[PDB]
Amino acid sequence: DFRTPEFEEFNGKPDSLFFTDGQRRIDFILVYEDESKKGTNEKQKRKRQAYESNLICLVFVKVHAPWEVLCTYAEIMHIKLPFEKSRMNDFYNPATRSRIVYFILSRVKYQVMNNVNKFGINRLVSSGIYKAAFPLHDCSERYLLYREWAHPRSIYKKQPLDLIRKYYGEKIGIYFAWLGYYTQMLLLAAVVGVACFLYGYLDQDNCTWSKEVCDPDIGGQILMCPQCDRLCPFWRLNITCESSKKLCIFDSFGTLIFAVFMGVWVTLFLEFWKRRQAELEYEWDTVELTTCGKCIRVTLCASAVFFWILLIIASVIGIIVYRLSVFIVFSTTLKYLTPQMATSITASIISFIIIMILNTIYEKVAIMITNFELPRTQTDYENSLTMKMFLFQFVNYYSSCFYIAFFKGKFVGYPGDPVYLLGKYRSEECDPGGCLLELTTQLTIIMGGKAIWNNIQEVLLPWVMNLIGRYKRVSGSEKITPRWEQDYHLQPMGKLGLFYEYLEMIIQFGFVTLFVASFPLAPLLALVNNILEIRVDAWKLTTQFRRMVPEKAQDIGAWQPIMQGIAILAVVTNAMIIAFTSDMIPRLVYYWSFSIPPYGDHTYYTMDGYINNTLSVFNITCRYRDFRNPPGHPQEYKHNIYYWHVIAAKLAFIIVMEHIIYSVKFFISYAIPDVSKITKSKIKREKYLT
């Protein structure tokens, strides 16, 4: 009855936000048009027309809710108006104003005489009756947000973090506060992250770690053993040094001050965000408002889902395979481009490419898994997607690094016996450089290669897809184009809005905390990323994408239990980065227990002569990066005291560095009040002083 908000087609002013009569400002536009399958056109018309009829208090339909109709659902949900505030009304905003008219779009459904009870635009736009329902914005509130925040000129400026909630809402504001804070806490781990390896840069020469390695009369003698079986040469340690001279900054003590700092920093990063969310819990309001057959389907999906997890695990195996083949050519074919780091650059590019391809499969297959599973509407759907998409992106992004980490440079044996992966082909081995540069280049050109490549995808892929709406649809308009046609031609965002833009940071946060024993610059590269990503995600959210609905979330949600699970994992893996993949505990032990006269030939503590005095010679019956017995002895190619010393000091380091840092991350979490103390002085002035 009387549905149609009549087709008074007049669009005289292009930058308009009002009706014909004025003084009425838009909150949201839906659109659908059916004049042109074959017999269901008016069926979708009668499926639509009863919804807008009780809503009352191409051609794109306006909405508006006046004083008597905005307030009658502002008594339903308890809105805080203004200073001080109170629930559900207090007399003294288009960030608030277009959530109430979406709260209006929450309760009211449709009335059928044949029992199809359809509610909201959840199924309305997905079945295909509507095409796009959206809000829109201004030209000002928007124009001053370009010059100060959302421009590449205003990168050095402070963030208008109030003027992000007041324009975009707590879905977006609590991302950009968490992007600005995590930019700030990266800075106090970048400047102390620069400083620690600057001492590693200053002390580059005089510790006999790359001092012996660059001396061809005594560090050129070290004729190693070829890794693969056929077509690999016996090589020396001249050719390592070009990598060994910058290896002296990646782990002398630069890590062991920083990795014991990052364990302190991440529990200072998380716990001061607990104080940061709590003072944004106050200044922004943030308050809440057959069965067996089905079970079997869900279990199959849960079980069916892991296999993909199994598949991603499998791809890395292909990289291991590809690496061996590609590595062999590398030596024959050829700025200090040694084949040890050529394969570590080239075949780490080829892996990173396949990470970006198989992300896009994961981008789609985890959706097709989840809707085939039984979700909730929109809140436990993404929360079932969170532990399913991220857990794909965990093992997509980090299982390559977790290969080059703990279990790549292991598994040698009796003739230099590889494990052979229980197949007829050989297995691979690390180079006697305490292989870390194969990791920290893989770490760099992922977390800096994702930082480059996704900031091309987040910049021009919304740009050229809007030019699909410009070079392919209409060009040369009436030169006064009305506002909603401009804003509709901007592409939408997806139902899950900032899921993809949190996930790409939790991937970055899982690089600056999981793998930071090695690469202390991983704050700095992620500092200059977050200096730009806070403008890139500013720009694409203001120019290109449509206006997100300003829904309210109190914390980030479902990534706070992940970072709290990443940080607990980060103490275990940083300690396993240091012991099992960093070659400094084999140096700490030599300095402290093999240059002393038991098993040693030197008076006081000195690192002179470390490299030949670690490895194991191998009769033809060359040296290699192992702690095994020399041939010709009582128990040859079984282990030494030295492995069993070092693997004990390896495993004691895991035990000491976890139990100290997990106590420090308990003391720091104890000795910090979780709600911030000035806000504890501010919330107590809101209940007794009213």
Binding site for a second copy (CB under 8 A): 572, 598-599, 635, 638-641, 644-645, 647-648, 651-652, 654-655, 659
Q: After which residues is the chain discontinuous, taking C to N > 2.5 Å? A: 36, 57, 82, 92, 139, 289, 334, 621
Residue among 358 and 647 whose Cβ is closer to a second copy: 647
Residue 458 as a binder of Ca ion (CB under 5 A): the answer is: yes
Burial of 596 (0-12, 13-18, 19+ CB in 10 A): middle
Closest CA to 60 of 492, 548, 482, 542: 482
Asked if residue 533 belongs to a known ligand binding site, the reply is no
**Residue 572 touches which member of a second copy, Ca ion, none, C-beta under 5-8 Å by kind:** a second copy
> What DSSP string describes 533-548?
HHHHHHHIIIIISPPP
d(CA 355, CA 346): 14
Asked if residue 458 belongs to a known ligand binding site, the reply is yes
d(CA 595, CA 582): 21
> What's the closest the beta carbon of residue 93 comes to Ca ion, in angstroms?
27
**Residue 537 touches which member of Ca ion, a second copy, none, C-beta under 5-8 Å by kind:** Ca ion
**Residue 626 touches which member of a second copy, Ca ion, none, C-beta under 5-8 Å by kind:** none
**Residue 659 touches which member of Ca ion, a second copy, none, C-beta under 5-8 Å by kind:** a second copy
User: CB under 5 A: which stretch of 190-198, 332-340, 496-504, 582-590 binds Ca ion?
Assistant: 496-504
d(CA 550, CA 338): 53
- To 10 degrees, the CA torsion angle through 119, 122, 125, 130? 40
What are 119's strand-pairing partners?
A: 109
> What's the closest the beta carbon of residue 677 comes to a second copy, in angstroms?
15
Residue among 373 and 533 whose Cβ is closer to Ca ion: 533
The residues near 335 (Cβ < 8 Å, ≥ 6 apart) are: none
Q: Is the dihedral of CA 293, 295, 301, 306 positive or negative?
A: negative
Residue among 212 and 658 whose Cβ is closer to a second copy: 658
Residue among 296 and 456 whose Cβ is closer to Ca ion: 456
> What's the closest the beta carbon of residue 451 comes to Ca ion, in angstroms?
9
d(CA 243, CA 343): 13
**Residue 468 touches which member of Ca ion, a second copy, none, C-beta under 5-8 Å by kind:** none
Closest CA to 672 of 280, 279, 272, 282: 272
> What's the closest the beta carbon of residue 398 comes to a second copy, in angstroms?
17
d(CA 122, CA 129): 11
Residue 537 as a binder of Ca ion (CB under 5 A): the answer is: yes
Shortest-Cβ-distance residue relative to Ca ion: 537
> What DSSP string describes 251-271?
SSSHHHHHHHHHHHHHHHHHH
Q: Is the dihedral of CA 510, 512, 518, 519 positive or negative?
A: positive
**Residue 245 touches which member of a second copy, Ca ion, none, C-beta under 5-8 Å by kind:** none
Residue among 22 and 634 whose Cβ is closer to a second copy: 634
Binding mask of the shown chain, residues 12 to 31, with x at each position contacting Ca ion by CB under 5 A:
--------------------
**Residue 607 touches which member of Ca ion, a second copy, none, C-beta under 5-8 Å by kind:** none
User: CB under 5 A: which stretch of 94-102, 152-160, 422-430, 535-543 binds Ca ion?
Assistant: 535-543
Decide: helix, strand or coil at residue 574. Answer: helix
> What's the closest the beta carbon of residue 638 comes to a second copy, in angstroms?
5
**Residue 458 touches which member of a second copy, Ca ion, none, C-beta under 5-8 Å by kind:** Ca ion
**Residues 350-368: b if buried by 16+ CB within 10 A, e if exposed:** ebbebbeebbeebeebbee
Radius of gyration for the alpha carbons in the chain, expressed in angstroms and rounded: 31
Residue among 118 and 639 whose Cβ is closer to a second copy: 639
**Residue 599 touches which member of Ca ion, a second copy, none, C-beta under 5-8 Å by kind:** a second copy
> What's the closest the beta carbon of residue 406 comes to a second copy, in angstroms?
13
Residue among 129 and 451 whose Cβ is closer to Ca ion: 451
Q: Which residue has the tokens 């024959």?
A: 332
Residue among 382 and 501 whose Cβ is closer to Ca ion: 501
> What's the closest the beta carbon of residue 286 comes to a second copy, in angstroms?
21
Burial of 303 (0-12, 13-18, 19+ CB in 10 A): exposed
> What's the closest the beta carbon of residue 162 comes to a second copy, in angstroms?
33
Number of residues near Ca ion (by CB under 5 A): 4
**Residue 647 touches which member of Ca ion, a second copy, none, C-beta under 5-8 Å by kind:** a second copy
Structure tokens at 403: 């290969």
What are 616's strand-pairing partners?
A: 624
Residue 438 as a binder of Ca ion (CB under 5 A): the answer is: no
d(CA 340, CA 142): 52
Whether 414 and 586 have beta carbons less than 8 Å apart is answered as no
Residue among 214 and 641 whose Cβ is closer to a second copy: 641
> What's the closest the beta carbon of residue 385 comes to a second copy, in angstroms?
18
User: CB under 5 A: which stretch of 147-155, 174-182, 239-247, 499-507 binds Ca ion?
Assistant: 499-507
> What's the closest the beta carbon of residue 320 comes to Ca ion, in angstroms?
31
> What's the closest the beta carbon of residue 184 comes to a second copy, in angstroms?
30
> What's the closest the beta carbon of residue 552 comes to Ca ion, in angstroms?
22
**Residue 640 touches which member of a second copy, Ca ion, none, C-beta under 5-8 Å by kind:** a second copy
> What's the closest the beta carbon of residue 635 comes to a second copy, in angstroms?
5
Residue among 134 and 502 whose Cβ is closer to Ca ion: 502
The residues near 558 (Cβ < 8 Å, ≥ 6 apart) are: 382, 383, 386, 387
User: CB under 5 A: which stretch of 64-72, 119-127, 146-154, 451-459 binds Ca ion?
Assistant: 451-459
Structure tokens at 494: 């997806």
> What DSSP string describes 278-299?
HTHHHHS------HHHHHHHHH
d(CA 364, CA 372): 13
Residue among 383 and 640 whose Cβ is closer to a second copy: 640
- Distance of CA 397 to CAs 313, 394, 449, 564, 689, Å? 11, 6, 12, 19, 52
Asked if residue 212 belongs to a known ligand binding site, the reply is no
- DSSP secondary structure code for residue 549 in this structure: P
Burial of 135 (0-12, 13-18, 19+ CB in 10 A): buried
**Residue 635 touches which member of a second copy, Ca ion, none, C-beta under 5-8 Å by kind:** a second copy
Residue among 252 and 574 whose Cβ is closer to a second copy: 574
**Residue 598 touches which member of Ca ion, a second copy, none, C-beta under 5-8 Å by kind:** a second copy
- DSSP secondary structure code for residue 23 in this structure: S
Residue among 143 and 667 whose Cβ is closer to a second copy: 667
The residues near 510 (Cβ < 8 Å, ≥ 6 apart) are: 394, 397, 398, 566
User: CB under 5 A: which stretch of 210-218, 298-306, 517-525, 526-534 binds Ca ion?
Assistant: 526-534
- Which residues fall in the annotated binding site for Ca(2+)? 458, 501, 504
Q: Which residues bind Ca ion (CB under 5 A)?
A: 458, 501, 533, 537
- Which residues fall in the annotated binding site? 458, 501, 504
